[model samples]
Target: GSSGSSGMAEPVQEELSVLAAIFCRPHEWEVLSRSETDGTVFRIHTKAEGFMDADIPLELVFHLPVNYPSCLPGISINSEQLTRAQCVTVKEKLLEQAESLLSEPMVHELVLWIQQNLRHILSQPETG
Candidate 1:
């Protein structure tokens, strides 16, 4: 995923976290509490136990040109494999959930908060 400031601000780390949580799988994968050594990065555990230690580490690097720090920030997702409709549907469903999750007026407004939060991310990428 390539995101420029205009598309998704680098400093919008909170948004990135939300996105990560939204698209994440739970069981064999985990997003490390860290970013990249060079650029944006994420981590995950292997579904195959032996591939990970504690959790095997995976890194994602959004290779930006040297002009990155100054260029107009736009996002490009290299999703050659996913059909446009598939990607759109994924975004729609996740956004639907995000709306409910972020819109609660009170602390205890939602019925199944824990389950929603915990499973929302993991449900797709982990066990599915």
Candidate 2:
């Protein structure tokens, strides 16, 4: 849960909806279309799509808490020795910490590091 002021409303709602639809309620996709919100609150559903993967696809859910502006969320993820999964965990952590991370100039250099390692990251056998 990112606790920052991402002021864009429609996009935020859409992004939240997409995440929920793809991750949380794959079997309840139709229910997601019915998700809605009033001015102060919104609901979302996410689902993941993989045509061939019946066993282990991908899914996630995110909720926007009320009193969001006054809160800061902490996030952590695991690599678990799975190479492809490693990047996902790393990305999630970076994103989770982005508010504090972006505050440091050294953290901005991570973009260059990611660029430098793009090929290796993309080429990991577990993913490729």
Candidate 3:
């Protein structure tokens, strides 16, 4: 006979909160309250080589599900510098990558992806 005791698991929200606290810095990342949902929202400001004198802002909003670590978290994005289509494209790309990385802490990865792509996208010349 075997006992059914595995151990305790930390809440997904707590994990996210702690992760945010660890990575987000006052001078770089900005953590904000979510008035509409039980989720976390944060802003990341970055600059590209071409736009070193300018600041590009990205807003990420997400909430963890009860079955997270197995299921994908709900994520949203906003940016004044990017248009709606551009925003959707970025969000879609994040979701696509995240979908392949279930059961992993993906916020950090997603943030980095966003940072890199945003800079790349902005550095490109506009097409006529």
Against the reference, the lDDT scores of all candidates come to 0.34, 0.37, 0.63
lDDT of 3 by residue, 1-128 (tens): 54884223454445555765755667655556542233444554544332565666676765555466677867787778778977776677778889987887777677766666665654445475
lDDT of 1 at 94: 40
RMSD each, Å = 13.2, 11.1, 7.2
TM-score of each: 0.25, 0.27, 0.62
lDDT of 2 by residue, 1-128 (tens): 77775554564355445545333655533222222232233222221221233222222222233323233222222222235666475455445544564323222233334434444544545534
List residue ranges in candidate 1 displaced over 4 A. 1-78, 103-128
Query: Model 2, 90: alpha-carbon shift in Å?
Result: 4.4
Q: How big is the positional error of residue 10 in model 3, measured in Å on the Cα after superposition?
A: 2.8
Q: Model 2 segments beyond 4 Å from truth? A: 1-11, 20-63, 82-97, 100-128
The predicted structure with the larger TM-score, 2 or 3, is 3
lDDT of 2 at 118: 40
